[PDB]
Design a protein around this ligand. Structure first.
Ligand SMILES: NC(=O)c1ccc[n+]([C@@H]2O[C@H](COP(=O)([O-])OP(=O)(O)OC[C@H]3O[C@@H](n4cnc5c(N)ncnc54)[C@H](O)[C@@H]3O)[C@@H](O)[C@H]2O)c1
Ligand code: FES
Ligand SMILES: [K+]
Ligand SMILES: [K+]
Ligand SMILES: [Mg+2]
Ligand SMILES: [Mg+2]
Ligand SMILES: [Mg+2]
Ligand SMILES: [Mg+2]
Ligand SMILES: [Mg+2]
Ligand SMILES: [Mg+2]
Ligand SMILES: [Mg+2]
Ligand SMILES: [Mg+2]
Ligand SMILES: [Mg+2]
Ligand SMILES: [Mg+2]
Ligand SMILES: [Mg+2]
Ligand SMILES: [Mg+2]
Ligand SMILES: [Mg+2]
Ligand SMILES: [Mg+2]
Ligand SMILES: [Mg+2]
Ligand SMILES: [Mg+2]
Ligand SMILES: [Mg+2]
Lengths: 128, 97, 74, 86, 122, 58, 137, 72, 48
RNA sequence: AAACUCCAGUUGACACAAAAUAGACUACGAAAGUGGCUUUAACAUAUCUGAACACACAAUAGCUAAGACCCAAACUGGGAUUAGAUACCCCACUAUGCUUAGCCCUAAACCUCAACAGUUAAAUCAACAAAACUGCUCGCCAGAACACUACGAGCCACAGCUUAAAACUCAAAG
């Protein structure tokens, strides 16, 4: 997880925010924010680390990253709420969709596919 | 050709869409005076939208604010506050006739 | 029922016939059984109001079409 | 129980006209729907029956309002026959 | 995020109310909250009788506390308010000003439903 | 104002469940219901009770 | 001025006085019109019982107990006892939609008690206990 | 038509004219129509601003003596 | 612009140094959120 | 009639049950379902289709262990009715409806109307119902009854669930 003092993605590039009061810094940080802001930062870090051209969002390489962040969030939610059948279905479908995207990416590049797999830690397993 | 043929235009005589009395104004659960205007003075029941005259969105906001105010101790439940009985009447309902 | 008097007067002046009252069933498709075996059907029917009093098409136009009587209708 | 007394569903009698006061209170309860609610709460109505009753009442309300609107629309044509004899 | 606390304090004297308000705000600060402002709605009779902490309350003092707190401190503050014996009622809600008001153009008319039944003559 | 009817019944284009399930078609008829007689009840019970009360006392 | 159907709330400084007594000082007449009985009890403003009457106490039994004539007879008896103890004006609180809901008030008026207000206190659960099952009659 | 904008504007501001419409006369000219004609004539002259065009049309009617009673 | 606006509002926040002053100021002052609406759609403030 | 009479009425204190009005709203969810208040987490997929058996769910009812008592209530007992009344009516009280941990995997689970994209053209069109069709794909169906059956097989289910026939009979069934 990113450090709690990390600023939000919306305010990470505004000029003059690097020199403000400590109250302002913690108001605009991840500490006083919901879990969605942390997921957006995690998605941004994965986009910078793994793939090039972060502007593109319809690319098959960015859809996998976005779905992987959602998969991790669902797993964290299910870690506490083990009786949430609806989210359990959402997690399973997200896994199936990610595997489908991996299959297409493997048949399309097999080079950025390896880049995605090692960057996110995902392993492509052939179904029985 | 001829310049007297009708042209393609949007209706210029069209009147602006009607707006509810609460349109554009914030509804707050702490505004007990405003919330009391949409309840029955004798039973405290929330009036329907056909009586209040509000839109769908404002009727929902009024209902949520009333329920929140009643459960948090800002508004009576079984009757309307007597202090607000002299407020302007904005509901289309008549009990005595 | 607003121009029945006017239309009947027009028929009198021009020498032709008019029917501005209730149209009994069989005045055209069964005219021989009512007027007589040797009755002569009209050669032309002019409708000034093709709709009856219930805002529906008159039955005379359908009967005229059945009997092959040309119709001039407003 | 925890609310103030004699503020809810209370109607004052004017000039000893108890009949008018009772009718006014009964009309207030009927308009607010309390009278019908109490009558239906004597026995427990199963949710399937409650949904069917609500659907029937909503359909009846729509038909009655539409019929009433047409009657008010056509009531203008209740005048005497203008073209008598035609 | 930004939360607002609606507090109903017991009808005490000024020094007791000030001490209770100071204790409540300090508890919020100890839970990592930045108290934006403190408001005084005033003292009024409760709409209904409230029995809390073995006390029957008919009049109370309504107060508002606006603050920014992390999502993991609201539950702790609620527990603290419950244990406090000078609080008749206390509720923490998302601040109304956080949610913006979407523009409304007007009450669009609803066209009457048509073609619900076939046009065959019954 | 007449309650809305769009998106209420079950048709071939309605995705949602039918809000209303009418047992008869929602079409205005060419008639109205006949007037209902009033179910009369007892009358002058108060006067009868007063007379019987005085009979008991006398 | 205009007659106020709204009750004279004790917070309000109403000038309406009945025989030198304010609205909050007028004794209350609690009427419980059940589906088979009508119980009437007159109590002072300080919750002190003064009179009590019902169809069973007046002699009506079984189905006869729980009619309009039985309800007004109980009202007359309750009013008579109340007037003996010094009751003139009454605030009527009715609890129930059973028979004799209005006949009980009529009996009180015939007894000699003047009604100044009518209040309905019928218990209406807001989503409460589950009533008994429906009857297959 | 193009003049429908002018008619709608004159029916909103300055309201309906005092003169009652005489639809029997084929050559009837109402106050609103006269305002439209003057607005069209000034448009033919070539004024750019629509607001100034509307004001000038009102000025012309005032000079001609046409009564202009605004609803507001 | 939001950051700049928030910068000024921090100066008015309640800290552990002015907490007593803010409490006393709150106890002296009053706040009213009540206002009624009319059929015309006008806000009627409670002039008291 | 039986029952209560440790009863009944006002007032005060007073839930581990259920959420009047809003609701004349038609929203959310894949479905089952979801309508008292607050907070947190959260509502899959940049073409579509694609599994009764793979996986994850699935009203009510039912089972195994630990808890709660307001009310309702299978079974049971009493009272009444009846030729009989093991029912309909009245009273009382259990399992059960609640919570926690596991199970069973059923419904007239139906809006009996598949998913995706598109149309209003003439023969639109057996009848009724909620008008008639086009392109593509999956599932299913083909006389009644035997039969939500026998056997086999699988299942935490052991009076069960899923799949599911045959012999005999009829000229009907719908
Ligand atoms: N059963 C397999 O291993 C398998 C392999 C390839 C394709 N399929 C596809 O499965 C469908 C069903 O085939 P069928 O009619 O022979 O089976 P079926 O419906 O008779 O089922 C019998 C067996 O097939 C399995 N099965 C059923 N549907 C399946 C599916 N969609 N995917 C995988 N397994 C399935 C069942 O679990 C069972 O083991 C077809 O569309 C077929 O192309 C199945
Ligand atoms: S019309 Fe604007 S909120 Fe109702
Ligand atoms: K409720
Ligand atoms: K169905
Ligand atoms: Mg039917
Ligand atoms: Mg007995
Ligand atoms: Mg409701
Ligand atoms: Mg698929
Ligand atoms: Mg198959
Ligand atoms: Mg189940
Ligand atoms: Mg169970
Ligand atoms: Mg019980
Ligand atoms: Mg039990
Ligand atoms: Mg749980
Ligand atoms: Mg269902
Ligand atoms: Mg089916
Ligand atoms: Mg399908
Ligand atoms: Mg079965
Ligand atoms: Mg079987
Ligand atoms: Mg076999
Ligand atoms: Mg077997």
């Amino acid at each position: 997880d990113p450090p709690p003092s990390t600023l939000l993605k919306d305010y990470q590039n505004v000029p003059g925010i690097e020199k403000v009061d400590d109250v302002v810094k913690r108001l605009l940080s991840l500490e006083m924010a919901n879990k969605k802001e942390m997921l957006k930062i995690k998605q941004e870090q994965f986009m910078k680390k793994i793939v090039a051209n972060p502007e593109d969002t319809r690319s098959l390489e960015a859809r996998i990253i976005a779905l992987s962040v959602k998969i991790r969030s669902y797993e964290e939610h299910l870690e506490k709420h083990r009786k949430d059948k609806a989210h359990k279905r959402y997690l399973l479908m997200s896994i199936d969709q990610r595997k489908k995207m991996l299959k297409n990416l493997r048949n399309t590049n097999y080079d950025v596919f390896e880049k995605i797999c090692w960057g996110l830690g995902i392993e492509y397993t052939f179904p029985p | 050709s001829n310049e007297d043929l009708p042209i393609s235009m949007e209706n210029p005589y069209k009147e602006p869409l009607k707006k509810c009395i609460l349109c554009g104004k914030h509804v707050d659960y702490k505004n007990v005076q405003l919330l009391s205007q949409f309840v029955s003075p004798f039973t405290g029941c929330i009036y329907g939208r056909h009586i209040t005259g509000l839109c769908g969105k404002k009727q929902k906001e009024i209902t949520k604010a009333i329920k929140r105010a009643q459960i948090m101790g800002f508004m009576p439940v079984t009757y309307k506050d007597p202090a607000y009985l002299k407020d302007p009447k904005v509901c289309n309902i008549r009990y005595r006739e | 029922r607003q121009f029945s008097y006017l239309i009947e007067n027009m028929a009198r002046d021009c020498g032709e016939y008019a029917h501005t009252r209730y149209f009994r069933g069989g005045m055209l498709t069964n005219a021989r059984l009512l007027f007589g075996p040797t009755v002569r059907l009209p050669d032309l029917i002019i409708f000034l109001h093709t709709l009856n009093n219930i805002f529906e098409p008159h039955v005379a136009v359908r009967d005229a079409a059945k009997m092959n009587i040309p119709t001039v209708g407003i | 129980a925890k609310h103030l007394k004699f503020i809810a569903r209370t109607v004052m009698v004017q000039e000893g006209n108890v009949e008018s006061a009772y009718r006014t209170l009964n009309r207030i309860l009927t308009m607010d729907g309390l009278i019908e609610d109490i009558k239906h709460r004597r026995y427990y109505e199963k949710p399937c029956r409650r949904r069917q009753r609500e659907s029937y009442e909503r359909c009846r309300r729509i038909y009655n309002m539409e019929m009433a609107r047409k009657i008010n629309f056509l009531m203008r044509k209740n005048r005497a026959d203008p073209w008598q004899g035609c | 995020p930004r939360y607002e606390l609606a507090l109903i304090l017991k009808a005490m004297q000024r020094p007791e109310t000030a001490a209770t308000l100071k204790r409540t705000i300090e508890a919020l600060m100890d839970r990592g909250a930045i108290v934006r402002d403190l408001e005084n709605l005033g003292e009024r009779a409760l709409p209904y009788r409230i029995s809390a902490h073995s006390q029957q309350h008919n009049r109370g003092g309504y107060f508002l506390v606006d603050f920014y707190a992390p999502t993991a401190a609201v539950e702790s503050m609620v527990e603290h308010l419950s244990r406090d014996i000078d609080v008749i009622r206390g509720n923490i809600v998302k601040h109304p000003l956080t949610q913006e008001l979407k523009e409304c153009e007007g009450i669009v008319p609803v066209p009457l439903a048509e073609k619900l039944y076939s046009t065959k003559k019954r | 104002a007449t309650p809305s009817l769009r998106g209420r019944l079950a048709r071939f284009g309605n995705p949602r469940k039918p809000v209303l399930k009418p047992n008869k078609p929602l079409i205005l008829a060419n008639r109205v219901g006949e007037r209902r007689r009033e179910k009369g009840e007892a009358t002058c019970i108060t006067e009868m009770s007063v007379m019987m009360a005085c009979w008991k006392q006398n | 001025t205009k007659f106020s159907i709204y009750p004279p709330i004790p917070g309000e400084e109403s000038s309406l006085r009945w025989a030198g007594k304010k609205f909050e000082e007028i004794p209350i007449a609690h009427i419980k019109a059940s589906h088979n009985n009508t119980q009437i009890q007159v109590v002072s403003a300080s919750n002190e019982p003064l009179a009590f009457a019902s169809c069973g106490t007046e002699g009506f039994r079984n189905a006869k107990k729980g009619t309009g004539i039985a309800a007004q007879t109980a009202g007359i008896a309750a009013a008579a006892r109340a007037k003996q103890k010094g009751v003139i004006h009454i605030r009527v609180v009715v609890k129930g939609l059973g028979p004799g809901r209005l006949s009980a008030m009529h009996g009180l008026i015939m007894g000699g008690l003047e009604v100044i207000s009518i209040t309905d206190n019928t218990p209406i659960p807001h989503x409460g206990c589950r009533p008994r099952k429906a009857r297959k009659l | 038509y193009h003049e429908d904008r002018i008619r709608a504007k004159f029916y909103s501001v300055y309201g309906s004219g005092q003169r009652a419409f005489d639809l029997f006369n084929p050559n009837f000219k109402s106050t609103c129509q006269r305002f439209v004609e003057k607005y069209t004539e000034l448009q033919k002259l070539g004024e750019t601003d629509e607001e100034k065009l509307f004001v000038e049309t009102g000025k012309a009617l005032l000079a001609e003596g046409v009564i202009l009673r605004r609803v507001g | 612009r939001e950051v700049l606006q928030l910068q000024e509002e921090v100066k008015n926040f309640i800290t552990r140094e002015n907490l007593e002053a803010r409490v006393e100021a709150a106890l002296d002052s009053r706040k009213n959120y009540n206002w009624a609406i009319t059929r015309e759609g006008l806000v009627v403030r409670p002039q008291r």
